[PDB]
Amino acid sequence: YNYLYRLFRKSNLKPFERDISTEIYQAGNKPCNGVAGFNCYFPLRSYSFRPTYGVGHQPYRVVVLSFELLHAPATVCGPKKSTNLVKNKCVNFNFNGLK
Amino acid sequence: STIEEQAKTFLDKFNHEAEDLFYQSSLASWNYNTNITEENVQNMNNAGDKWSAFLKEQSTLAQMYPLQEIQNLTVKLQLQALQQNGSSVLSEDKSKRLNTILNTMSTIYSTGKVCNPDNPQECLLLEPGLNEIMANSLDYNERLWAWESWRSEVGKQLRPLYEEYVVLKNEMARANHYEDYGDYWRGDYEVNGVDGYDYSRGQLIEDVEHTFEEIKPLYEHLHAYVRAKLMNAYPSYISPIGCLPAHLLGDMWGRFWTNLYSLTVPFGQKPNIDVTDAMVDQAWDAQRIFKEAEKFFVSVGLPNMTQGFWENSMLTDPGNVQKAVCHPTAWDLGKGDFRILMCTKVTMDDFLTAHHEMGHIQYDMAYAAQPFLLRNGANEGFHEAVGEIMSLSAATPKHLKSIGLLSPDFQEDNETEINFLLKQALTIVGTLPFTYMLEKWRWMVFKGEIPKDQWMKKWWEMKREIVGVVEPVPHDETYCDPASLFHVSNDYSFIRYYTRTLYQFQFQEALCQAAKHEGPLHKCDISNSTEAGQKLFNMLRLGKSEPWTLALENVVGAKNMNVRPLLNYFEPLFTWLKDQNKNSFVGWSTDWSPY
Numbered sequence: 001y002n003y004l005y006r007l008f009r010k011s012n013l014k015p016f017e018r019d020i021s022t023e024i025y026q027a028g029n030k031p032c033n034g035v036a037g038f039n040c041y042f043p044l045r046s047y048s049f050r051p052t053y054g055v056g057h058q059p060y061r062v063v064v065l066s067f068e069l070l071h072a073p074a075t076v077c078g079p080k081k082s083t084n085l086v087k088n089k090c091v092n093f094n095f096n097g098l099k
Numbered sequence: 100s101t102i103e104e105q106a107k108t109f110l111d112k113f114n115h116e117a118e119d120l121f122y123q124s125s126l127a128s129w130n131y132n133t134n135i136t137e138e139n140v141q142n143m144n145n146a147g148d149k150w151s152a153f154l155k156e157q158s159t160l161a162q163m164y165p166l167q168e169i170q171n172l173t174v175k176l177q178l179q180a181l182q183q184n185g186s187s188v189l190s191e192d193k194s195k196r197l198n199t200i201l202n203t204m205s206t207i208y209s210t211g212k213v214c215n216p217d218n219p220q221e222c223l224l225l226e227p228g229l230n231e232i233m234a235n236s237l238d239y240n241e242r243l244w245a246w247e248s249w250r251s252e253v254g255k256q257l258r259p260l261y262e263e264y265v266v267l268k269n270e271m272a273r274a275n276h277y278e279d280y281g282d283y284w285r286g287d288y289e290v291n292g293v294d295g296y297d298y299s300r301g302q303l304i305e306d307v308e309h310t311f312e313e314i315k316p317l318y319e320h321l322h323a324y325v326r327a328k329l330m331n332a333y334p335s336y337i338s339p340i341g342c343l344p345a346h347l348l349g350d351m352w353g354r355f356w357t358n359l360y361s362l363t364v365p366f367g368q369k370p371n372i373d374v375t376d377a378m379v380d381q382a383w384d385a386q387r388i389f390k391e392a393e394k395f396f397v398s399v400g401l402p403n404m405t406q407g408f409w410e411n412s413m414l415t416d417p418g419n420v421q422k423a424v425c426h427p428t429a430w431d432l433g434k435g436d437f438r439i440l441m442c443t444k445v446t447m448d449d450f451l452t453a454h455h456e457m458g459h460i461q462y463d464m465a466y467a468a469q470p471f472l473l474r475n476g477a478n479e480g481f482h483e484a485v486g487e488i489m490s491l492s493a494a495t496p497k498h499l500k501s502i503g504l505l506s507p508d509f510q511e512d513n514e515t516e517i518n519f520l521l522k523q524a525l526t527i528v529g530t531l532p533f534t535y536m537l538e539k540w541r542w543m544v545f546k547g548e549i550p551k552d553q554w555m556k557k558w559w560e561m562k563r564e565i566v567g568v569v570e571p572v573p574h575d576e577t578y579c580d581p582a583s584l585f586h587v588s589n590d591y592s593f594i595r596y597y598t599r600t601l602y603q604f605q606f607q608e609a610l611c612q613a614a615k616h617e618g619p620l621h622k623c624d625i626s627n628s629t630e631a632g633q634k635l636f637n638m639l640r641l642g643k644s645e646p647w648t649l650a651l652e653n654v655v656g657a658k659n660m661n662v663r664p665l666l667n668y669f670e671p672l673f674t675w676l677k678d679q680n681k682n683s684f685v686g687w688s689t690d691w692s693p694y
């Protein structure tokens with residue numbers, strides 16, 4: 001019961017928005033006043049994972065990689081594969097972008 | 100802001116909490132059923148108490164939303180299912196007395212022991228011994244002694260209990276804005292608010308009558324044939340013009356006639372289609388039986404089994420040290436968890452039962468996308484019907500030749516088709532008048548049409564008039580002879596078997612015309628046909644979200660139930676019974692001429 005999801009909110013989230021509020025959801029006309037009674041629900045519900053659930057209900061760990069480019073100098077580069085060095089022959093050399 | 104959005108948010112929170120509490124309850128019941136130990140018993144009792152209190156408080160919060168301002172049919176259906184009081188509408192003392200009455204009916208039926216006078220040093224229970232002595236014995240007075248002794252003892256200990264039970268259930272139903280308890284049981288078939296597909300609670304009884312009016316000639320011929328064969332069994336006691344004696348029906352109550360296949364065989368010299376020898380010679384274990392059933396279900400186009408099904412189901416008896424319930428049960432634990440509790444023996448009957456329970460599991464699997472309170476059959480007949488159609492299709496000789504149990508050089512002549520169809524008629528057509536009689540008696544005793552001191556006289560007369568079975572001796576109102584059956588004694592609806600029987604052959608005709616079968620209906624196999632599986636899965640995916648009339652129109656095209664598929668199934672047997680009943684007398688008389 002350490003994993004929770006938000007079941008109710010008054011509006012949809014913006015993209016890449018994090019909502020960590022535990023304010024009591026206002027489903028009724030009367031004010032909730034912080035007490036989860038009639039028409040007032042705690043907005044966060046627990047995913048109760050057990051090792052005997054189907055493939056549609058087993059826990060899935062998700063990591064989402066978002067790649068952004070900014071006016072700053074881009075410093076996250078991929079690994080550059082290096083061919084073994086050959087000498088004493090007329091070859092095409094590419095050293096650190098110098099060709 | 101409106102009431103309907105409040106209902107949707109409340110139903111979402113109820114469904115989230117309900118699927119978890121349901122899983123805990125179902126897993127505790129499973130741990131009790133596969134492992135009968137006292138800590139599993141108290142865990143099941145705790146989980147059941149938590150589940151019942153949860154539905155009590157959620158129905159308390161659910162009855163604050165009126166239904167007349169809700170236009171969505173799914174939300175209205177979930178709130179109508181949720182707001183049902185059950186036994187909670189009464190005072191606490193009367194509700195406690197009703198649960199006490201139900202518990203003591205359960206303990207009287209479960210621990211009812213009836214044995215021989217003057218030999219009391221041990222005695223014999225109903226489920227181990229009385230079923231065997233009713234199905235296997237050929238002695239007239241011994242079956243009469245067991246029948247009369249069990250009905251006498253059980254009737255004298257259960258008659259005032261049923262006397263209070265009918266009054267308490269009538270007060271419960273009239274407090275729940277129903278006319279009677281029969282109307283409460285017919286409310287499962289009620290469809291309201293949908294134009295063209297509307298079905299009332301009151302119409303079902305004449306609908307059953309309308310089906311039974313066409314049931315009645317075929318059953319009469321079968322009854323005459325059974326009477327002729329019982330004339331071979333019993334020479335002088337049964338009359339040609341009269342009804343059957345009651346303790347000769349092969350069961351304790353006459354519900355099934357399938358124990359008379361040895362006595363009523365058309366051609367005893369011909370062998371049966373029992374394929375047990377092929378399983379035991381080739382060593383067909385239970386795991387590969389379920390693999391073959393999975394192969395059948397992917398042949399028809401339905402999705403295959405989950406990995407947790409194969410991991411968590413116990414398909415074999417575990418041993419002497421661990422005790423488990425041997426009753427075949429399909430379990431939908433929730434959260435995508437599906438299991439089968441089955442102590443498989445290497446027989447053809449357990450093979451057909453495994454197909455039946457995997458049909459149950461596939462039906463439970465298809466409506467998993469639905470909300471939790473709509474995760475059921477559209478009525479009580481569909482859930483058993485979709486398993487019984489698999490039991491129909493797996494029992495065909497073509498399917499047994501397909502999977503290697505039956506030899507390709509097997510000759511399928513008309514005689515083995517006649518005796519197979521007669522076995523199916525003794526299983527299927529035999530239970531229909533008993534079911535209709537019992538349900539119509541229960542409907543009139545809840546309605547108050549039957550007076551209190553006239554029960555047995557009316558009941559036996561209907562057994563003379565509907566089933567064509569006469570009592571051995573007259574019984575007065577000190578006895579309660581209906582209450583000896585399991586379903587009526589433990590508060591169970593009985594019309595589900597009638598509706599299941601009709602929907603079985605309706606679904607069978609719809610799939611066999613979907614799969615383009617060019618012969619008679621009893622030869623038909625739904626294997627290797629994707630379009631029939633898609634047509635069926637269109638009904639399996641709905642669950643309880645749609646009316647059962649709409650689901651029936653999705654399968655067979657007709658919203659109302661139909662009796663023509665059942666007589667079309669038994670058509671060559673009907674012609675055969677018309678051929679061989681020329682010397683015998685078709686039909687019965689209500690007089691006591693046999694006994």
Ligand SMILES: *[C@@H]1O[C@H](CO)[C@@H](O)[C@H](O)[C@H]1NC(C)=O
Pocket residue numbers: 134136421
């Ligand atoms: C069944 O219950 C007993 C009682 O403690 C336990 O020892 C045994 O492991 C249980 N069986 C299984 C398969 O868990």
Ligand SMILES: *[C@@H]1O[C@H](CO)[C@@H](O)[C@H](O)[C@H]1NC(C)=O
Pocket residue numbers: 171172173174
């Ligand atoms: C009814 O509510 C369900 C949500 O449970 C929604 O998917 C469906 O579209 C609604 N139907 C109508 C007609 O509003």
Ligand SMILES: *[C@@H]1O[C@H](CO)[C@@H](O)[C@H](O)[C@H]1NC(C)=O
Pocket residue numbers: 162182183184187188275276
């Ligand atoms: C359930 O019982 C309560 C208490 O008597 C009652 O107020 C309520 O109307 C009942 N529900 C229905 C649907 O009749």
Ligand SMILES: *[C@@H]1O[C@H](CO)[C@@H](O)[C@H](O)[C@H]1NC(C)=O
Pocket residue numbers: 403404405406
């Ligand atoms: C079910 O079928 C799919 C594809 O047909 C397959 O990938 C999967 O492994 C199968 N699962 C089982 C348990 O056989």
Ligand SMILES: *[C@@H]1O[C@H](CO)[C@@H](O)[C@H](O)[C@H]1NC(C)=O
Pocket residue numbers: 513514517675
């Ligand atoms: C089966 O068909 C043959 C061929 O006409 C016929 O002689 C025989 O009587 C039939 N048997 C039954 C039981 O219909």
Ligand SMILES: *[C@@H]1O[C@H](CO)[C@@H](O)[C@H](O)[C@H]1NC(C)=O
Pocket residue numbers: 398501626627
């Ligand atoms: C159905 O398909 C399976 C798999 O190809 C095959 O083994 C079986 O013989 C087929 N059944 C029929 C009746 O053709």
